[PDB]
Symmetry: C2
Subunit: 226 residues, 2 copies
């Protein structure tokens, strides 16, 4: 009786298995692909392409199809190996990473960093999408009551004092809430953004603290006898 060929992926809902970077370095190439595919969506997408290539090669082993598998396997192995490369795990290389790259790396080796990283990613995504929703709604109301040249002038005043569309849009929405403290739409955006920023900063703090514990950055100093 046939099941479902998952390849290097694990069954849906399976509790993830985390190991310290040294223990992961000791894994077989196959076991490493299984480990990384479960935690990183790039290694997963590559393992799916490797699975389809393995299926084609089994059915018909023509040199065109067999090398398509060889390439697919190599690409997955290269992606998985890069995430645990000794070069990337040096104290020097870990200092060079951004807070985001540092927590995304730690999230592959620690359960709590993984969860905290997932939370920060949803709060940061909603910070961005809610700024665009609000801006496009508030700009429509602004143009209706003040005209489009008046808006372009305000956006110009912001771009002339200060980067990307979302940074200028969030500053516009904040400045207008400070100028009109009685507008419920602007004061709801203001309140909701403050609450989203609090949640994103706490998620990042938790993930960074967990990353420091994992990479052993939190216990460098020991006092001797004075």
């Amino acid at each position: 009786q046939p099941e479902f060929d998952r390849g290097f992926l694990r069954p849906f809902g399976a509790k993830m298995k985390f190991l310290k970077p040294d223990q992961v370095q000791k894994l077989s190439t196959d076991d490493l692909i299984t480990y990384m595919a479960e935690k990183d969506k790039n290694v997963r997408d590559l393992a799916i392409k490797l699975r389809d290539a393995k299926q084609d090669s089994t059915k018909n082993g023509t040199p065109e199809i067999k090398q398509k598998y060889d390439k697919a396997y190599e690409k997955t192995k290269a992606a998985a190996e890069k995430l645990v490369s000794e070069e990337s795990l040096t104290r020097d290389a870990l200092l060079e990473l951004t807070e985001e790259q540092y927590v995304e790396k730690a999230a592959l080796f620690d359960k709590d960093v993984y969860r905290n990283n997932l939370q920060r990613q949803t709060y940061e995504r909603l910070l961005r999408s809610e700024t665009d929703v609000s801006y496009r709604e508030v700009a429509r109301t602004f143009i209706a009551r003040e005209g489009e040249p008046a808006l372009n002038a305000k956006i110009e005043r912001l771009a002339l004092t200060l980067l990307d569309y979302l940074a200028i849009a969030a500053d516009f929405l904040k400045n207008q809430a400070n100028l009109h403290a009685d507008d419920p739409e602007l004061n709801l955006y203001k309140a909701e953004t403050k609450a989203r920023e609090i949640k994103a900063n706490r998620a990042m703090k938790e993930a960074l603290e967990g990353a420091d514990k994992l990479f052993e950055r939190n216990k460098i100093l020991k006092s001797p006898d004075m």
Copy 2:
């Protein structure tokens, strides 16, 4: 300078809203009632903008074809604004025909706090729907990857069948996420959806409770 933008019946951006009880609004002039309702209702607002553009075209070119368009645009705004305060819609009998939403949406026009609570409720409800979509799409992608697309299709079909036997995408999507969360308590993506939905539902329920309480206290004053 003198660069005065033709606002029409609209007020300056960010202007503090003026709220009156339904009896006081019934006593307003047709022009004052349009100003009152275009500030609070987006349908009356969109019509007032159409009325402003029609008045501008009629001034630019007063053809019988264009003068007829302004008159029609003014009466459409007049009717829409008048309907929101019609005596027949404010009777206890007519207010009971209204859904909790509609009742709160009507009261929002006459009370400041009901307006703020109605706005909060609308944001939290919108995010409840869009976050169910984001999660479903994420969890479905991982499900298909590990179990296959026929396996998902069978689950969605059984869910669509229990629902159609008595369609609603978000209803089906929520039920799928709920069932999977109950089956797999250790999946971080499903645990995050569950936790985030609970926190948002709490916020959405509080906003609608506070809005209904104010809506009751408003239609209580008659």
